[PDB]
Amino acid sequence: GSSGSSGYRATKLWNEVTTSFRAGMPLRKHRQHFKKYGNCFTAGEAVDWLYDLLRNNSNFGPEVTRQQTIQLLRKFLKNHVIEDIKGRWGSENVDDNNQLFRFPA
């Protein structure tokens, strides 16, 4: 065997969070008039689910503010953690106002 991990500390955190987020909740009931979508969720809602999850930890602590959440989220989409409803992945631009997202495959 051979041991040679890089930034294990940082890597661990990311994995931990991503692991909790990915699973988090199965589905959420959001306002929707049309049927086109339903199993998706607006970015906003996520901001909280993730934000709270971040502060809960010690690394981020309660010092982390909503703003930080949106900034970090940008990385998630870039890392292919969350794909848009249509199927657009690979960007660092994510709003917390109104945007339908979905899990990739």
From Swiss-Prot:
Reported tissue expression: Expressed in testis. Up-regulated in bladder cancer cells (at protein level).
Superkingdom of origin organism: Eukaryota
Residues of the full protein shown: 11 to 108 of 811
Task of the protein: May be involved in transcriptional regulation as a transcriptional corepressor. The DEPDC1A-ZNF224 complex may play a critical role in bladder carcinogenesis by repressing the transcription of the A20 gene, leading to transport of NF-KB protein into the nucleus, resulting in suppression of apoptosis of bladder cancer cells.
Subcellular location: Nucleus
Subunit structure and binding partners: Isoform 2 and isoform 5 can form homodimers and heterodimers. Interacts with ZNF224.
DEP domain span: 21-105
Protein name (Swiss-Prot/TrEMBL): DEP domain-containing protein 1A
